[PDB]
Design a protein around this ligand. Structure first.
Ligand SMILES: Cn1cc(NC(=O)c2cnn3ccc(N4CCNCC4)nc23)c(C(N)=O)n1
Length: 288
């Protein structure tokens, strides 16, 4: 699969010269981080997301890795790359716009958006697991599974994004440790590169979905969301004490069933964790 070659100046024009202001005030910046900034634009009679990236040589390796992975990977639970740009000063990746933004923003109700229902959340959890399943089936390790890298389309379908740090398989080691600390598996923090780390990170995402709490909060106890698994196991608290209060359709059974999947995902011994196909099965059984 191949993609259109966009002109830098077409992208610069449709994104109002890559404006840093939010959409409400009258700007174009949508999200920042992800080794680049995502801006809003309207090209070829449609709304698009333009990622401007942004060591300069390692940044283009992340640009080339994302196109390589997208040429090879087309799925309904992955973001859709429409084209790219190299001719300008900066590097750009053009995607199909995901109107509902990131799961992180939707879980925090950024800008006053209504809280996601449990029904919506089960659908997102299932969809996200289908996207990771597709990557693992095609021998790709994401390396940065987190709620800020799961996007939501017009119908709240989960779309996995950011494949710049992706790795093939088709256990490796590296001196360049990359990812988001609060989501990373112990071995991933040590340099190991394995698809088992993606499962651990997906367990943190399932806890964010259940609780609505961010993976890391400086002004909180525990500051790291993954530590609640121990509070529940060493029966001081229970999962009901952590369920997101911003839901009226969350029954205890299905929540506990999602938590069970998260608990299994968050096993510290990488070999004890389930593979993605099992995570996928258990999430399907939860609804059904
Ligand atoms: C409403 N709306 C649409 C958005 N962003 C998008 O529609 C979007 C489309 N493809 N894609 C690929 C990656 C990406 N980001 C990677 C880094 N983490 C943030 C997401 N965002 C997008 C956003 C956003 N916050 O990026 N908000």
């Amino acid at each position: 699969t191949r993609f259109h070659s966009f002109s830098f100046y077409e992208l610069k024009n449709v994104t109002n010269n890559f404006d840093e202001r939010p959409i409400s005030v009258g700007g174009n910046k949508m999200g920042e981080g992800g080794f680049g900034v995502v801006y809003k634009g309207y090209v070829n009679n449609t709304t698009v997301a333009v990622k401007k990236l942004a060591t300069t040589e390692e940044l283009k390796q992340q640009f080339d890795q994302e196109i390589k992975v997208m040429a090879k990977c087309q799925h309904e639970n992955l973001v859709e790359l429409l084209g790219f740009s190299s001719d300008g000063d900066d590097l750009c990746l053009v995607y199909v716009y995901m109107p509902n933004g990131s799961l992180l923003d939707r879980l925090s109700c950024l800008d006053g958006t209504p809280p996601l229902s449990w029904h919506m959340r089960c659908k997102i959890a299932q969809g996200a697991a289908n996207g990771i399943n597709f990557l693992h089936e095609n021998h790709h390790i994401h390396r940065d599974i987190k709620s800020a890298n799961i996007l939501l389309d017009e119908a709240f379908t989960a779309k996995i994004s950011d494949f710049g740090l992706a790795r093939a398989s088709e256990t490796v080691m590296t001196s360049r440790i990359v990812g988001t600390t609060a989501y990373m598996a112990p071995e991933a923090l040590r340099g190991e590169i394995t698809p088992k780390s993606d499962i651990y990170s997906f367990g943190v995402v399932l806890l964010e979905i259940i609780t609505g709490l961010p993976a890391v909060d400086e002004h909180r106890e525990p500051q790291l969301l993954l530590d609640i698994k121990e509070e529940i196991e060493d029966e001081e608290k229970t999962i009901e004490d952590y369920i997101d209060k911003k839901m009226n359709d969350a029954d205890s059974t299905s929540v506990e069933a999602m938590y069970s999947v998260a608990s299994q995902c968050l096993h510290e011994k990488k070999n004890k964790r389930p593979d993605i196909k099992k995570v996928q099965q258990l999430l399907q059984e939860m609804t059904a």
